[PDB]
Amino acid sequence: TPPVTLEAARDNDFAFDWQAYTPPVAHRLGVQEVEASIETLRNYIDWTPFFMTWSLAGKYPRILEDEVVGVEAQRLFKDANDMLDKLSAEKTLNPRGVVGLFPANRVGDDIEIYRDETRTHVINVSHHLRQQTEKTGFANYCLADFVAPKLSGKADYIGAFAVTGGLEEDALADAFEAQHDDYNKIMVKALADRLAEAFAEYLHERVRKVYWGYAPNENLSNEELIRENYQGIRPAPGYPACPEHTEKATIWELLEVEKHTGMKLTESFAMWPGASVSGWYFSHPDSKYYAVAQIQRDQVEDYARRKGMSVTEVERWLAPNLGYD
Ligand SMILES: Nc1ncnc2c1ncn2[C@@H]1O[C@H](CSCC[C@H](N)C(=O)O)[C@@H](O)[C@H]1O
């Protein structure tokens, strides 16, 4: 599909009657350190990516009864849960996280995040990109579109989070490495990954039901959570609706992530521990995932201005999304 100008894309933003809508008010404004036990998180694990890591095809639980890999799958599942039992009893891998909710409003392709409900002083800006090709019967989406425009005068909110399967991951994996035990090195890293993703799922439910509080009576099964049968999204920097990784630095500042969790960012803006998830929370009922995809030089240069970066810097961070050489 052919490219459009930045202005043409913005003229085709997500269309919504903000005058008739009351964005749900965040019940708990502020930043809260959290933790979750392995016992708590194991009921929020999505096991299917675990089997994928072990190069086995099929959806859990059906994979256990499969005819070619079911026996192997059952053995992997037993070893995994045996290791979860031990990590749990010995408290040797300890999931940690932090959550925050803030007053927020959209301005253009960005989301202003305010110190307080006066909505004057901006403590941070969450910057977003916009789809920039010809859209047939649909908006040129930008994640900012799911927050009320400041011009509408509607009180709106944004959340963020960072969670990890635990700071101990490297020590446990490295010890299996020193033992030449590649099986259990793979296993403990796969389990840390499951616990991080389970914590992201559990904490998102906590946010919808309690911290933000717009779905207090939600009652979804784990399978329904895996199918994303809830209202709102938790998009993560680096993923297709917000591919620009340096926005993780804004999450780290907003939530004081390292102070509250021990989690760190690298020079490439990768998270440490490896088993880590971070992202935003959007409440809007029409919010959804999509791909920004390829963008043009006008949007790159505008993003650079808004970020305080040179055009050269932004072309490094957005290299995979450049629709030009
Ligand atoms: N287009 C997109 N833009 C931003 N984030 C996306 C995205 N598509 C998926 N995600 C992210 O990926 C997560 C889903 S994958 C994680 C849950 C899954 N049950 C598992 O264990 O693997 C989403 O919650 C969101 O954080």
Side-chain angles (χ1 to χ4, degrees), residues 42-60:
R42 55 202 300 187
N43 300 311
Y44 288 82
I45 288 171
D46 174 359
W47 282 99
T48 295
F50 165 90
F51 291 105
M52 285 169 176
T53 287
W54 285 106
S55 298
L56 296 184
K59 183 185 169 291
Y60 174 90

Side-chain angles (χ1 to χ4, degrees), residues 46 49 194 197 201 226 228 234-236 239-242 289-291:
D46 174 359
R194 285 309 87 204
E197 299 284 356
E201 196 73 63
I226 289 156
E228 298 181 343
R234 60 165 190 275
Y239 281 68
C242 40
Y289 302 120
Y290 58 86

Side-chain angles (χ1 to χ4, degrees), residues 266 268-296:
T266 74
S268 295
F269 291 94
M271 295 176 287
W272 180 88
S276 288
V277 188
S278 64
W280 307 101
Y281 296 123
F282 291 80
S283 62
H284 193 284
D286 296 316
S287 62
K288 62 163 183 174
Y289 302 120
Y290 58 86
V292 166
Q294 314 311 279
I295 67 175
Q296 298 301 319

Side-chain angles (χ1 to χ4, degrees), residues 287-306:
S287 62
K288 62 163 183 174
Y289 302 120
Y290 58 86
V292 166
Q294 314 311 279
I295 67 175
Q296 298 301 319
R297 202 177 302 252
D298 52 5
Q299 184 168 184
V300 164
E301 294 175 4
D302 194 70
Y303 189 79
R305 288 187 293 273
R306 283 138 57 198

Side-chain angles (χ1 to χ4, degrees), residues 21 41 46-47 58 80 84 122-123 146 158 161 174 200 204 214 242 248 254 263 282 306-307 323:
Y21 181 61
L41 290 184
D46 174 359
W47 282 99
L84 286 177
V122 169
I123 58 174
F146 300 122
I158 200 73
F161 71 98
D174 288 348
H204 194 191
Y214 62 83
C242 40
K248 275 169 266 179
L254 265 173
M263 296 166 60
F282 291 80
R306 283 138 57 198
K307 289 276 285 171

Side-chain angles (χ1 to χ4, degrees), residues 21 23 32 81 105 128 160 164 234 277 292 318-319:
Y21 181 61
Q32 177 67 64
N81 279 281
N105 283 107
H128 284 294
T164 178
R234 60 165 190 275
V277 188
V292 166
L318 288 181

